[PDB]
Amino acid sequence: GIDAAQIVDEALEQGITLFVVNNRLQYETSRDSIPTELLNKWKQHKQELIDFLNQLDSEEQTK
């Protein structure tokens, strides 16, 4: 399977901050030539990441 935490760790290493705004997966980074392989991964497990970022700050949106 895939670990939302694992995706956020690798993303941060490249300088990419993951988070959810209004139940929407969004990221903020300053640079160019982003890792497409990682980009698609975000959308691939969007729902998986959202639940992670949501329960990471809210820890009350369990499913």
CA 39 to the chain's CA centroid:
10
Helices (H) and strands (E) in the chain, counts: 3, 2
The dihedrals phi and psi of 22, each to the nearest 5 degrees, come to 60, 40
Instruction: Give which of 22, 61, 24 is closest to 46, Cα–Cα.
Output: 24
Give the span between the Cα atoms of 30 and 32, in whole angstroms.
Answer: 7
Contact between 42 and 11 under an 8 Å Cβ cutoff? The reply is yes
Tokens of 40: 């698609």
Contact between 12 and 18 under an 8 Å Cβ cutoff? The reply is yes
Contact between 29 and 14 under an 8 Å Cβ cutoff? The reply is yes
Tokens of 30: 């300053």
Q: Measured on CA atoms in the order 39, 37, 48, 5, is the torsion positive or negative?
A: negative
Residue 45, CA distances (Å) to 32, 38, 41 in order: 23, 11, 6
